[PDB]
Ligand binder design. Structure first.
Ligand SMILES: O=P(O)(O)O[C@H]1[C@H](OP(=O)(O)O)[C@@H](OP(=O)(O)O)[C@H](OP(=O)(O)O)[C@@H](OP(=O)(O)O)[C@H]1OP(=O)(O)O
Ligand SMILES: CC(C)(C)c1ccc([C@@H](Cn2cccc(C(F)(F)F)c2=O)NC2Cc3ccccc3C2)cc1
Lengths: 102, 102, 102, 102, 102, 102
């Protein structure tokens, strides 16, 4: 309880990129004595959960566990104005154009 | 009054995701020398009251004080990018289609 | 007048949680010499008048001086997506659906 | 002459609150050796023209002559999630309902 | 390339007021051994190019050849909520009232 | 491989201006022992790929290979309010007016 660097608290800021935070999930796992597959609940899940919902709305479409070159190119969409370029419109199309409910 | 790290002032930074804040509610409790049940208002309900309403509006849907993993996945959208990806659009259609008041 | 933080101007950040600013307000209440009832204007009404329009606007809805526990909950909306979810939902439909003037 | 901050341009930030920058120019008039009365037209006029379009827009609305406590009271409307929260209902409604031009 | 503070890489933060940054541009211009006219490229067009698109768009409206106090006056609008109130609203009116395309 | 700051991972902060990050990519290119022609592929492509999608959507529009002055001028639009001033008008019109899908 209250244990840091175990990924149980690693976190990507709203404006913090997936790539940069990945270093926080990799590097903070360096501090953690684990197995490579063990780290996979992270690389795949806490990397997808605590990491900037842009990554959720992204890794949910792109998919999770996408290679570091894929989740990179994609989660590079993550970002304050960086995602506003793409996500801004998406929510705007989630309501009116593409995902308009009823 | 003004006692720190007792959960009474632990709060979800409105931008701090539900996790960043839960963690704070957890680890800082290590410092708070309390009873396990006492920590239960602190985990269930503080985590539901002074926790940035983004996680509250969710937490209710999830059920208040639901398991941390459960409130975590749902409230991971709490934090910036999620509530902006999703809730911007949700409330928007609450106003127009789903929740049109009168 | 203008003595350091006499309450007369204590400030809540546009995003600073009410509980937090309240920490500054209380902290500076200590700095100024006021009877408790005298501090009551300082708590009940200043807190409403000069504390981040996120709370002050609400504080009009709860009425000036709603018990700090009620107001704590009201002003717990203060925040980015936590506040803006509500403010967006209310303002967006005020203009179009709920309060469309003329 | 016109050395920095003599009430030449004492500028207010965008989110920097009115009481924060008002505290600065008062302090900066101290930086300027002028008549007490001189400082009066400096605090009433120059302050208003060069300070935060949020409080500059308010300052016009209150209209000059508003005692500082009254200025800051209206300018307490200033702020990102703070003024924006009031600007959603205030300005987002100018384009559509209140200030619909032609 | 990447020459320190040669104006070419001097920049205005997206939020940085026009002036705060101009203090930088100028402050280093004094350091860049240049002719007055040369400094005038830095003031007329670079000043614009490397300066916060809130205002970069403005300085065109103002158009080059305007006094620094002229651009500054128009650029007190520069700012997050400072500029959003006038310009976000302008954008709000760019979709609905005045700049409605097609 | 994937040595730090070898350009393979150089990145632009979402808010980090294009010009700023470009200084991180160029400077770090100095750290990268690469043929100039190689560096060119890094300046043309990699600069485009990991440099803040604000620019990615811009550089794509301008066309890859645009001169740094050309990428810069447009990417000076990169930024929070700075890119938002344009992008908000754009994405908003991508859903409703110009890019309305179906
Ligand atoms: O994206 P950045 O340049 O890093 O800064 C952003 C941006 O603030 P600006 O108005 O200065 O551009 C957000 O503004 P929005 O476009 O989302 O309105 C703001 O949002 P809020 O005013 O709603 O708080 C957000 O904060 P957040 O991520 O908490 O939503 C804040 O980021 P930082 O606080 O991390 O600097
Ligand atoms: C209500 C609030 C929380 C403050 C909010 C809401 C929506 C957004 C983004 C979209 N959006 C959606 C998901 C993720 C991103 C992220 F940044 F994380 F990448 C993103 O940009 N659009 C608005 C931003 C803004 C500011 C003032 C004027 C207009 C707009 C449009 C940003 C913040």
């Amino acid at each position: 309880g209250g244990s840091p660097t175990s990924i149980l608290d690693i976190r990507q800021g709203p404006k913090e990129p997936f790539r940069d935070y990945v270093d926080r999930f990799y590097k903070t796992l360096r501090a953690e004595q684990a197995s490579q597959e063990v780290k996979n609940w992270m690389t795949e899940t806490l990397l997808v959960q605590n990491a900037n919902p842009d990554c959720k709305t992204i890794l949910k479409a792109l998919g999770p566990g996408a290679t570091l070159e894929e989740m990179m190119t994609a989660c590079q969409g993550v970002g304050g104005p960086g995602h506003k370029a793409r996500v801004l419109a998406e929510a705007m199309s989630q309501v009116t154009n593409t995902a308009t409910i009823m």
